[PDB]
């Protein structure tokens, strides 16, 4: 249930001996977990949103200049004065005019003006910034079950960095109750939001401390004293005829060419809403149970509504009428390589499939993976029952395979703090998690101050290097890293 | 647009009743976006379709969907009379925008 | 003005899609190519120069790799 | 010759033709038809689902920046004052006379 | 956008002042600069890079010049 054919989607091997898991959610796909017939559920992370905050600098990215003047003193009375330099919005660079007699004067040379132009400004950019309080989540619940549109299956979670667990309780069976981390989320206290005009989206501080236009500090009371002004206002003069004082227009297509790296967000009444965070909320269960379990096996017929599906991620859907029998049943269904039916292959990615209640048709949606070949679906009527023949694609390694480039990305973008998934490694994992957790310092130094292109030539000059070199301690290095950043680039997005 | 839909129809009691709406490729036949809107003429429109198939809950499990190329066709047995409700057959189309069917005056004879 | 920060020497990674990643790429290469078809002249340049050091064949194919990609974009 | 709100440049054709901004033909208006527009806005799909249309908006600044080391012009109706530029001539002295000599 | 062309690459040259000539030349090196003070790293890995390309010494420095104006600007 809206986990199915989001993609973008792991599928969790199960609960093992702890009645807990760590599972890593993001923007998009889900991840469906199924352990020992507790229900299947799956959790996106939605929306999560930051409130409350705070304006850390901003910078004017238009310039309005006025009011020129000029100095003209001639060479040798010393300089020239013009009073704005002492009031403070006001640019001045004093440059020297050599001077002839058309001016007047009587040495020649050069002659110190400087025209001071009134700087002002229009449509600043606002870089707010933010602090892992006033943060949240609101993730959401899946729980299979049998539906298809539409408590009982879908229970939403707040979740804070102030309160990281989740009590969320659903009709019909225990609570979920899951135990987030929001506190170590994508590396905050880094983002701080930055707002052009009606639109919104997270810059680190060091593109944002690193930007040469006005400073203005924190807030905009009648007009602000703006910092800097040389990178706007650029004046110079040639022949020695007074000076040019030059707007040099705005500059949003600059900063919106200079950010390629920035989420974006949107953002309504502060509330500043984002997209695309990472957290570790990890599921704890025992409190999850099978509805229903008994409920017989109920009998009747069965008539396909839709003709089912196959998703992208190894997976086929039925809805089923039930053709009007009796209240909240149960009804099986199989994998049968052999016969209309019989032995029973494959999995079932949800787990008690269960008619819901009453008159005529309940439709059961069932996630079922097929086995590798192509089987029968089967309903479960012993004897009157409709079918179908599903072909499932590949040669074993051969999606298990694509499975290893999945878990390349899957730690690729996420990086080794996507070891989790995989639950309770323990003495094992410590050695997944300890071996990038001492790299993931110098890969994320090394080349941290690489981006796209950037990699793809280093990724190619050191692999270069670890083909011709000597023995020994280089014979293995490109691969050990020139190959990791040509993967890195391929990776992400792809 | 304006889904076609048959201006009116009836028949006894408990028979079988099928309004079959006819859209194209780009709203009915390429989506399994249906409705079916029962209107009582001079109250509110109410639902009597979802998702093809389906029904809401309140439904009169009397009501039968079904969907072939581009049709739309509701199918009613077992009838309990005062089941005249202008049928009106709408959906959504692939440009973003719902267009409701001509509608089909129920004829309860 | 001369903006100098550009936001991909940090960017960030996430499941969604950056900023102008796709236009970015692209436009990284374009940029060198309709410089480098302005000036073929600076080809030759490059080329002497750069088989002119290091005397061990492909570094010097380093060297043109090192030249012409830092003649357009910074300079 | 190079125009922007009101102050002027002069910029190389090799420099001219390769702004990446969506060209117009400056044949004529009525319906000015834009070729390219692809440079400009940028087409942002969100991973989830669905695609949104963004604005590069104003380029103004960033192409100033691009003109560093035009030359500064200055124009009017007919003709655009050009400062700069140098000139090269064969000066003939051979009538003259040093006046009340 | 990221309009590509950079005037300088041709310029003009007369005695009247260029458009932005002084910000311009340096800015270029300031961008340079900061873009090095972010990453201290890539100079740690450009420079045991180069160093292991051309074992002539001063083809070496050769090196990290090249690649340390590579890196902000080219990408």
Request: hydrophobic fraction near 35%; glycine fraction near 10%.
């Given at each position: ?81 013009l009073d704005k330099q002492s009031d403070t919005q006001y640019v001045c660079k004093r440059t020297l005019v050599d001077r002839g007699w058309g001016n007047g004067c009587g040495l020649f040379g050069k002659g110190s003006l400087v025209t001071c132009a009134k700087f002002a400004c ?79 989206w997270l810059v680190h501080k060091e593109w944002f401390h690193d930007i040469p236009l006005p400073w203005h500090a924190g807030a905009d009371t009648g007009t602000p004293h703006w910092n800097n002004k040389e990178a706007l206002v650029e004046f110079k003069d040639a022949h020695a ?254 | ?109 | ?75």
């Open positions: 249930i809206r986990c199915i054919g989001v993609s973008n989607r792991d599928f969790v091997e199960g609960m093992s001996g702890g009645t807990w898991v760590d599972v890593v959610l993001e923007h998009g796909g889900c991840v469906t977990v199924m352990a020992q017939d507790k229900p299947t559920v799956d959790i996106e992370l939605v929306t999560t949103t930051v409130s409350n905050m705070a304006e850390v600098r901003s910078y004017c990215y238009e310039a309005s200049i006025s009011d020129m003047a000029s100095d003209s003193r001639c060479p040798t009375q010393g300089e020239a004065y229009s449509k600043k950019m606002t870089g707010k910034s933010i602090q892992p309080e006033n943060l949240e989540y609101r993730i959401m619940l899946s729980v299979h079950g049998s539906q298809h549109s539409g408590d009982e299956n879908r229970a939403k979670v707040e979740i804070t960095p102030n309160s990281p667990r989740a009590e969320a309780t659903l009709g019909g069976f225990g609570s979920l109750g899951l135990d987030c981390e929001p506190r170590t989320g994508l590396d905050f206290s880094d983002l701080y939001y930055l707002t052009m005009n009606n639109k919104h005829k007074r000076q040019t004082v030059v707007v040099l227009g705005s500059q949003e297509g600059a900063v919106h060419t200079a950010l390629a790296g920035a989420l974006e967000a949107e953002m309504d009444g502060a509330k500043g809403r984002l997209s695309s965070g990472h957290l570790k909320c990890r599921l704890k269960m025992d409190k999850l149970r099978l509805k229903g379990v008994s409920y017989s096996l109920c009998t009747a017929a069965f008539t396909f509504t839709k003709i089912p599906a196959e998703t992208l991620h190894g997976t086929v859907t039925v809805e089923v009428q039930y053709a009007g029998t009796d209240g909240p049943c149960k009804v099986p269904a199989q994998m049968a390589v052999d016969m209309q039916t019989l032995t029973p292959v494959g999995r079932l990615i949800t787990a008690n499939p269960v008619i819901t209640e009453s008159t005529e048709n309940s439709k059961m949606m069932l996630e079922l993976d097929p086995p590798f070949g192509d089987s029968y679906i089967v309903i479960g009527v012993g004897e009157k029952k409709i079918t179908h023949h599903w072909h499932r694609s590949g040669s074993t390694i051969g999606k298990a395979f694509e499975a290893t480039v999945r878990g390349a990305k899957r730690m690729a973008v996420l990086g080794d703090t996507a070891w989790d998934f995989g639950s309770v490694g323990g003495a094992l994992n410590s050695l997944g998690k300890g071996i990038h957790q001492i790299f993931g310092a110098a890969f994320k130094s090394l080349f941290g101050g690489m981006s796209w292109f950037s990699q793809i030539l280093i990724g190619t000059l050191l692999m270069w290097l670890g083909l011709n070199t000597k023995n020994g301690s280089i014979s293995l290095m490109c691969l050990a890293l020139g190959g990791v950043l040509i993967f890195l680039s391929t990776a992400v997005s792809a | 647009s304006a889904l076609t839909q048959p201006a009116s129809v009836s028949g006894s009691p408990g028979q079988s009743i099928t309004i079959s709406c006819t859209g194209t490729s780009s709203d009915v036949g390429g989506f399994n976006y249906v409705s079916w809107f029962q209107q009582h003429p001079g109250k509110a429109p109410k639902l009597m379709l979802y998702d093809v198939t389906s029904r809401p809950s309140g439904v009169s499990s009397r009501f039968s969907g079904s969907k072939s190329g581009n049709t739309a066709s509701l199918t009613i047995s077992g009838l309990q009379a005062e089941d005249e409700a202008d049928y009106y057959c709408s959906s959504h189309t692939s440009r973003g925008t719902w267009v409701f069917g001509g509608g089909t005056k129920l004829t309860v004879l | 003005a001369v903006t100098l920060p550009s936001h991909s020497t940090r960017k960030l990674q996430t499941r969604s899609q950056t900023w102008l990643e796709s236009r970015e790429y692209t436009k990284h290469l374009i940029r060198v190519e309709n410089w480098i078809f302005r000036n073929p002249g600076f080809a030759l340049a490059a080329a002497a120069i750069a088989w002119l050091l290091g005397s061990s064949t492909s570094q010097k194919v380093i060297y043109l790799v090192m030249i012409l990609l830092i003649a357009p974009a910074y300079s």
